[PDB]
Design a binder for this molecule. Structure first.
Ligand SMILES: [Zn+2]
Lengths: 198, 159, 245, 88, 136, 49, 98, 49
DNA sequence: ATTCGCCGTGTCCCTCTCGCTGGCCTATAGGTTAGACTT
RNA sequence: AGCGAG
DNA sequence: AAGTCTAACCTATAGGATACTTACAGGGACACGGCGAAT
């Protein structure tokens, strides 16, 4: 209500926003060099836990500043789709198709996206469009990393659906399971017995 | 109200048989529950004699009602608009009312419209159910070989 | 204790919390909004149609029209804005009802909040085509349109395998008949019972059942299934081409 | 391989675009590019897209269930109510 | 094999649409009966590639001689079946969305960069409070 | 006699079915499968040089 | 509202539909139909509705203590749990040794 | 319990005097539980003999 | 009341490898598609 | 879910 | 046998008017925040 008062009285000459678009706008109208110089000044004249916080934030910002990678790539306008064979859809048993979980997450993102596009086109009160944007946000979060925020999106059986990040963490991830050790052809095994004449 | 073994009409269920009136002294008063049985699944109902007429305890109509409903189902020209919702709700209400004339009118209308085109899935089930209850009460009133009852019902309805 | 102040200051402080549950959050987003009055809704609709006619009249007279008076232009722009805000307020009042009727298809297929938003769209269409000339309750007319929209969206977005809407209809019909037939007889109904029930040859029920099947996520446990899912001919083809050589 | 060439288009936001075909074919007027929206040639033909009128619009919905005169009456009622609100 | 470097870095939306061979629009995976991927779906052949080697959706192309040619009616590039394993899709968001990792991972890199705090960021991004982009 | 008979244990593979998400060999006697050359084995090989 | 109520009583079991060997062969699940007396009562006026409702095919323990599901033979292993109740546990805190 | 939930939901939609215990009772919860318990459970263990 | 220095509490990633066995209801316009004759 | 080797 | 020539089928869209308004371990470690002296 205070926001509504402030805008409807003095909406002009100051810009307010909500959500990821607001954060993207905030990043755009911001100079990395100014923040880096300020951090350098504070550490030049800081002390204590203020010093430590300055050091950490300076690391974070100088990561972007020293390199040519700008931070605008943190906020996403388009999301990539892993190819199909890494996202199987194959029939099995009695011809019953058995896809993976990424299809559900991608489908949820797509559903939210189409609904949001339509809604904006028709023109709806800010409440519903905010709700749809929030849905898209939490769904992209589940897609990229399920369980990291909100609730673990659980498919049937209350099982948390595997997300793209999950294919990295832990043993079952790609790294520890199919790169640092792989099944091999031209191989076998059997039980062993003492061969003293050998 | 009724003695033992009487035939009773308890809508929307229709025909039923009474066996006794057990007076359940529950609530400090012997509730003369007329124990009643139906044919669908042998369900048992205990109807207070104090309010038996209130809940719909009654008798099958005499032959005067039979001829009245014959005339009702003989009458053509019952119109209807293009939609479906109006008749669906109307026949729902008039079948839940436990009446003989209106159930006959609606079942006649639905029969003729089915014979014309064929309407839907569940309305065929309602048509069947209405025909079954009408045949049951006809056999109850006449005691006329309920298979014969449905045959004659079809014969007069076709006209 | 109402104006106990402290007792309402606690409520205000509790209103400003983080809260992460989106269903609870939206429960409170419509929390701020209230209900509506039937006659008030009639006047709301009247204002909506008036502002609509005003904006279309602007658009028509925008081409080779007239230089409208400042007062006339101001008032008609205000009527149009009033109509927009009127429909926003009306939708805000109806969010509660649509949520209350959308809670009845939860636990299946898709997210409850997803059901909510599809129902909200159905509500927008309902107000888009609401007729108050007879002057009846808005909600009773609306329920049909919201249910239409949510059933459509459920059908279009139910399964990973896309099936046409007609097939969604025949499948949920098959399921309902199956359920009630079991409830009555207690024996598994044979496919021929369904075939004669719908008056079809003894194949449609089989195809519809096969379509009705839900895909099984390759992720499973007992270990996921995806691991366990499946050079003579390649070597042979190279060799045969050489043999032709 | 087969005699093959590349058809030319450009999407709306400037980026000149290009997709291959064979020589023996019709280089179509319209194509949905890799960027993700329809585009046409800078070569000739110019097949005059001629978009269809929108599916639906709130006005025509009110039209088939209402007329001009009563809506005019509502407009006048609102106008006089607001005129009384401002100046009386 | 000529490898020297894996320079991972932030991928801007421009790069995301640069990789993409097409753009999946609708959430349609496979047809109910013919068991074929839809058009503009999550598996559409035109986006990722042909599901069968040396074929196309309408199937007028089957020989190998005209390899590397995309059909007319259905617009599927005639390539290997395995090319689907590599070609990548993308989706255009109606409204921008924040990468979960940088936002939520402790310490919140987004918050540290923008001087903001974790709960505060959770509030702004998930539509619980407003933020001022700028003021003159 | 315990139920660990060799005829159910022995197994070799030279070319058998391969998984589809990753083209590594399957694993298990019910299929052909290979034998998981895991991480500790790789450390052993690196140690030998 | 409380103007009507529902209740159940008298759970009865019928004879086993097929003999143990038969069910083991033909994949049938050795089980018995379960019937219960369901009673629906109206409180606002006073009514009863008594029925014998079919509550499923309850699997039945064979003579040897093994269930037969889908032909296969299965055993329900006894579980161990912590009894619900009240538990007073004492712990020594190292911060002040108390 | 799920049975009770669904029937309590049903009593609101159904009109009084137009309902019979057959209508109130939908077995789908209970049996499902049993079917879901004997198959796919951590204690209905496959008989080892 | 802010600064700075301490404590204090809450929320999160990690703890061996390799085998084997089994387990609603229509109405309509436009897209789409079946079959059949032919030179 | 159960089991074998350390 | 593809090329027409003929004749269906199938599906995205849309449309109907009582009433009904808030779901359903543990351990280590670091970062976000209590308690106290100083200006
Ligand atoms: Zn083609």
């Amino acid at each position: 209500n205070l926001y509504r008062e402030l805008v409807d009285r003095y909406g002009e000459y100051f810009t307010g926003a909500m959500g990821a678009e607001s954060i993207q706008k905030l990043i755009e109208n911001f100079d990395i060099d100014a923040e880096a110089e300020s951090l350098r000044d504070v550490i030049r004249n800081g002390k204590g836990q203020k010093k430590l916080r300055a050091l950490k934030r300076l690391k974070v910002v100088a990561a972007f500043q020293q390199s040519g990678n700008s931070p605008m790539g943190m906020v996403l306008d388009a999301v990539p789709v892993i190819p199909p064979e890494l996202r199987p859809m194959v029939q099995l048993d009695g011809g019953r198709f058995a896809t993976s979980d990424l299809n559900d997450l991608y489908r949820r993102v797509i559903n939210r996206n189409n609904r949001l596009k339509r809604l904006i086109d028709l023109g709806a009160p800010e409440i519903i469009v905010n709700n749809e944007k929030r849905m898209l946000q939490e769904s992209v979060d589940a897609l990229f990393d399920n369980g990291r925020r909100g609730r673990p999106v659980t498919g049937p059986g209350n099982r948390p659906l595997k997300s793209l990040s999950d294919l990295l963490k832990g043993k079952q991830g790609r790294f520890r399971q199919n790169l640092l050790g792989k099944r091999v052809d031209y191989s076998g095994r059997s039980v062993i017995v003492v061969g003293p004449q050998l | 109200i009724f003695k033992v073994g009487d035939t009773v009409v308890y809508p929307h269920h229709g025909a039923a048989l009474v066996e006794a009136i057990e007076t359940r002294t529950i609530k400090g008063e012997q509730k003369e529950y007329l124990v009643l049985k139906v044919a669908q699944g042998d369900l048992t109902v205990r109807v207070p004699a104090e309010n038996a007429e209130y809940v719909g305890v009654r008798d099958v109509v005499g032959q005067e009602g039979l001829d009245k409903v014959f005339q009702v189902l003989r009458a053509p020209h019952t119109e209807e608009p293009t939609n479906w919702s109006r008749r669906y709700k109307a026949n729902l209400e008039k079948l839940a009312s436990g009446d003989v004339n209106k159930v006959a009118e609606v079942v006649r209308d639905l029969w003729r419209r089915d014979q014309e085109r064929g309407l839907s899935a569940g309305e065929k089930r309602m048509l069947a159910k209405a025909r079954q209850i009408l045949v049951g009460e006809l056999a109850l009133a006449e005691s006329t070989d309920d298979a014969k009852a449905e045959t004659i019902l079809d014969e007069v309805l076709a006209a | 204790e109402d104006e106990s102040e402290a007792l309402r200051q606690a409520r205000k402080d509790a209103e400003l919390t983080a809260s992460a549950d989106s269903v609870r959050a939206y429960l409170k987003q419509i929390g701020k909004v209230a209900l509506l009055n039937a006659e008030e809704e009639v006047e709301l609709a009247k204002r909506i149609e008036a502002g609509l006619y005003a904006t279309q009249l602007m658009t028509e007279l925008s081409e080779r029209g007239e230089k409208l008076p400042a007062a006339q232009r101001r008032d008609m722009m205000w009527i149009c804005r009033d109509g927009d805000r009127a429909k926003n307020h009306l939708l805000e009042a109806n969010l509660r009802l649509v949520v209350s009727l959308a809670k009845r298809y939860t636990g299946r297929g898709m997210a409850f909040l997803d059901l909510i938003q599809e129902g909200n769209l159905g509500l927008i269409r309902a107000v888009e085509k609401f007729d108050y000339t007879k002057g009846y309750k808005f909600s009773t007319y609306a329920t049909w349109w919201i249910r239409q929209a949510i059933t459509r969206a459920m059908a279009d977005q139910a399964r990973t395998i896309r099936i046409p809407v007609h097939m969604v209809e025949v499948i949920n019909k098959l399921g309902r008949i199956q359920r009630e037939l079991l409830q009555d007889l207690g024996r598994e109904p044979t496919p021929e019972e369904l075939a004669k029930e719908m008056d079809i040859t003894p194949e449609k029920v089989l195809e519809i059942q096969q379509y009705a099947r839900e895909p099984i996520s390759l992720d499973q446990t007992i270990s996921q299934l995806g691991d366990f899912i499946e050079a003579v001919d390649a070597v042979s083809f190279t060799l045969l081409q050489d043999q032709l050589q | 391989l087969a005699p093959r060439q590349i058809a030319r288009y450009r999407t709306d936001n400037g980026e000149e675009f290009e997709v291959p075909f064979a020589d023996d074919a019709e280089i179509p007027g319209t194509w949905l590019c890799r960027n993700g929206m329809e585009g046409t040639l800078i070569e000739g033909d110019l097949p005059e897209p001629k978009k269809v009128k929108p599916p639906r619009t709130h006005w025509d919905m009110l039209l088939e269930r209402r007329s001009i005169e009563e809506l005019e009456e509502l407009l006048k009622e609102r106008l006089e109510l607001i005129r009384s609100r401002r100046r009386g | 094999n000529f490898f020297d470097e894996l320079r991972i870095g932030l991928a801007t939306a421009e790069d995301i649409r640069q990789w993409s061979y097409g753009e999946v629009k609708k959430p349609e995976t496979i047809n109910y009966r013919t068991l074929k991927p839809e058009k503009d779906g999550l598996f559409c052949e035109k986006i990722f590639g042909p599901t069968r080697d040396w074929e196309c959706y309408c199937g007028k192309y089957k020989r190998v001689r005209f390899k590397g040619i995309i059909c007319e009616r259905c617009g599927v590039e005639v390539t290997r079946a395995k090319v689907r394993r590599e070609r990548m899709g993308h989706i255009e968001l109606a409204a921008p969305v924040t990468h979960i990792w940088y936002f939520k991972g402790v310490p919140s890199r987004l918050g540290y960069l923008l001087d903001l705090a974790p709960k505060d960021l959770e509030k702004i991004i998930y539509f619980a409070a407003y933020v001022i982009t700028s003021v003159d | 006699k315990l139920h660990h008979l060799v005829d159910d244990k022995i197994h070799a593979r030279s070319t058998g079915p391969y998984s589809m998400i990753t083209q590594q060999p399957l694993g298990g006697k019910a299929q052909f499968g290979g034998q998981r050359f895991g991480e500790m084995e790789c450390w052993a090989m690196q140690a030998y040089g | 509202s409380g103007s009507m109520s529902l209740s159940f009583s008298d759970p009865r079991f019928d004879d086993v539909k097929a003999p143990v060997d038969e069910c083991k062969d033909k994949d049938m699940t050795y089980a018995a139909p379960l019937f219960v007396t369901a009673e629906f009562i109206n409180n606002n006026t006073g009514e009863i509705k008594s029925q014998t409702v079919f509550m499923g095919d309850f699997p039945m323990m064979t003579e040897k203590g093994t269930f037969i599901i889908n032909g296969t033979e299965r055993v329900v292993v006894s579980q161990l749990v912590r009894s619900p109740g009240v538990y007073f546990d004492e712990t020594i805190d190292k911060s002040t040794d108390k | 319990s799920r049975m009770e939930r669904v029937v309590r939901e049903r009593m609101t939609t159904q009109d009084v005097e137009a309902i019979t215990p057959q209508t109130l009772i939908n077995i789908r919860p209970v049996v499902a539980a049993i079917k879901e318990f004997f198959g796919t459970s951590q204690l209905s263990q496959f008989m080892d003999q």
